[PDB]
Coordinates of C-alpha atoms and ligand atoms in Angstrom, one line a residue:
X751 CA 96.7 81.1 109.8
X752 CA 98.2 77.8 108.6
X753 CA 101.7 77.9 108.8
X754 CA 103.5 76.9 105.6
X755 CA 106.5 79.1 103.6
X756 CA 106.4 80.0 99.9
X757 CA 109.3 77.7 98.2
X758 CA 109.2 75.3 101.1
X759 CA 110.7 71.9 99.8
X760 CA 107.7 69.8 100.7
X761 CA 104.9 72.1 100.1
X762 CA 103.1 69.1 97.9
X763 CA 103.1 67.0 101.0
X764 CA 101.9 69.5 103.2
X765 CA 99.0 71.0 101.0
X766 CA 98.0 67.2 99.9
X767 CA 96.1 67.2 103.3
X768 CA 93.8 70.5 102.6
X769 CA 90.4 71.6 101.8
X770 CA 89.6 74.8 100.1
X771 CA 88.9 76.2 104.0
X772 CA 92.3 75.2 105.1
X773 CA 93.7 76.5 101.6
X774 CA 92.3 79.5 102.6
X775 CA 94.2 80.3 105.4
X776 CA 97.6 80.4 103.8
X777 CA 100.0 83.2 103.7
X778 CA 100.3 82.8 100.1
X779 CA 98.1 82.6 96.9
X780 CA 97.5 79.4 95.7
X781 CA 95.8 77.8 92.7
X782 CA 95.6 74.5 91.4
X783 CA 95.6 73.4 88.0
X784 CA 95.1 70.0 86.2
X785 CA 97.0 69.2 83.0
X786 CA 94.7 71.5 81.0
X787 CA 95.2 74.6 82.9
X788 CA 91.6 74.5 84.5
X789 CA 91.0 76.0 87.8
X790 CA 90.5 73.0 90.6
X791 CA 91.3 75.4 93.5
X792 CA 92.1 79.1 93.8
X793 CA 92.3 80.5 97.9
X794 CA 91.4 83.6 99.6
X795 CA 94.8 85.2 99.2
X796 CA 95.3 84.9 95.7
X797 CA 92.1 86.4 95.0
X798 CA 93.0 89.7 97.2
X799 CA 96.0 89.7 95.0
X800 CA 94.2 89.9 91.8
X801 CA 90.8 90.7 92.4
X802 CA 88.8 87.5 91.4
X803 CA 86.1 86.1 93.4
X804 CA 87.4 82.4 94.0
X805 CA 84.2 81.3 93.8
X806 CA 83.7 82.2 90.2
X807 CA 86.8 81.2 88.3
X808 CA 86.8 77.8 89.4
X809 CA 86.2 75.4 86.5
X810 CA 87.7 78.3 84.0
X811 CA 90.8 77.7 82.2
X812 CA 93.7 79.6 83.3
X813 CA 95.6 80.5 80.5
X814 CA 92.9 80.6 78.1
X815 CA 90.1 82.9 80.5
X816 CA 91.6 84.1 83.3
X817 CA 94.9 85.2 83.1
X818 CA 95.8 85.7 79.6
X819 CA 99.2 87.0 80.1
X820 CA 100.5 84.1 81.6
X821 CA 99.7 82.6 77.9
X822 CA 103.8 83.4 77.0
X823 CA 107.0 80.4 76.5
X824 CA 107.7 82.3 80.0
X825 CA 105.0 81.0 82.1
X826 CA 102.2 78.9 80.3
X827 CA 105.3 77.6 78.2
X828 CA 106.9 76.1 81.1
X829 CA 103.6 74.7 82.4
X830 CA 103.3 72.8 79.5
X831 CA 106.7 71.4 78.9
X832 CA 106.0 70.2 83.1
X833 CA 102.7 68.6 82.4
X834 CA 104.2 66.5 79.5
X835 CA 107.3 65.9 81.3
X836 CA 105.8 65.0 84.4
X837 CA 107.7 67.1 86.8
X838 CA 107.8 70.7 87.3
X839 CA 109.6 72.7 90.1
X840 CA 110.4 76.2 88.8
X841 CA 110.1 79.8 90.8
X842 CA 110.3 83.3 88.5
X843 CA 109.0 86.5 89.1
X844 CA 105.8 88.0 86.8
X845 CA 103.8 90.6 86.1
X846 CA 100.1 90.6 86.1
X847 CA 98.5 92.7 84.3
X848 CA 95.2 91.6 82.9
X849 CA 92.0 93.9 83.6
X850 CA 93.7 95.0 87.0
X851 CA 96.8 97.3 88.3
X852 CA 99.9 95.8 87.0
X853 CA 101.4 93.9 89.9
X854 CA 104.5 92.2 90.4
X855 CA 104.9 88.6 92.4
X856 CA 106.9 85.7 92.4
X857 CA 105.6 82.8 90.9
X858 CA 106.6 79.1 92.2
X859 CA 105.0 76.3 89.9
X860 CA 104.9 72.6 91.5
X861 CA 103.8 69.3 90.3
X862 CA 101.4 68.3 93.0
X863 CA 101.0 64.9 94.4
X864 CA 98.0 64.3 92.7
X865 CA 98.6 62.8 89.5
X866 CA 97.6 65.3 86.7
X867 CA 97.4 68.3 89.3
X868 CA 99.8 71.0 89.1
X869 CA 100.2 74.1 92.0
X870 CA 100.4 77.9 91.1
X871 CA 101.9 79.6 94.4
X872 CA 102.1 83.5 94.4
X873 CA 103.4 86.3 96.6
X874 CA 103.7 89.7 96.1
X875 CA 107.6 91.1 95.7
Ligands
HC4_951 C1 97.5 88.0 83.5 O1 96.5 88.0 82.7 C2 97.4 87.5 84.9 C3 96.2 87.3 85.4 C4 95.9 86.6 86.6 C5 96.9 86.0 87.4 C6 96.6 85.3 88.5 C7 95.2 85.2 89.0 O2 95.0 84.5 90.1 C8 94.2 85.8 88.2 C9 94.6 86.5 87.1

């Protein structure tokens, strides 16, 4: 395992330092994003949350392929008013629901360190 905690204050700075192995070892599902919602990174436990191969949906847009029904003012609506303002910090719980059981998490969205990179953390609740 690498030892980080979901909502952890300095998560940027700690994940700023990983490669897809070492994002692979988290406790949590993450996925980053750039500015258009395309899939950069997507880990091992995010894809045994939902069921996609993380291998596949890198390079497909988010909101637009994979996970239509975060495409809603209550999730892709607050990634967008981040991206433009250039800061996002915002934690919410969500159900997903697309083309698999409907399952509930906690979402925690994060302006990465890398300028026009955005995080998607998930956990199951
Ligand atoms: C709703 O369509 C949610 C879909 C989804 C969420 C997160 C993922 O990593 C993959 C699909």
């Amino acid at each position: 395992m690498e030892h980080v905690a979901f909502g952890s204050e300095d998560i940027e700075n700690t994940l700023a330092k990983m490669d897809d192995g070492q994002l692979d070892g988290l406790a949590f599902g993450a996925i980053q994003l750039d500015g258009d919602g395309n899939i950069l990174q997507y880990n091992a436990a995010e894809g045994d949350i939902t069921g996609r191969d993380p291998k596949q949906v890198i390079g497909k847009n988010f909101f637009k392929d994979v996970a239509p029904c975060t495409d809603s003012p209550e999730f892709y609506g607050k990634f967008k008013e981040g991206v433009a303002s250039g800061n996002l910090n915002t934690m919410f719980e969500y159900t997903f629901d697309y083309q698999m059981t409907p399952t509930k998490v906690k979402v925690h969205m994060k302006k990465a360190l890398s300028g026009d990179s955005y995080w998607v953390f998930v956990k199951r609740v």
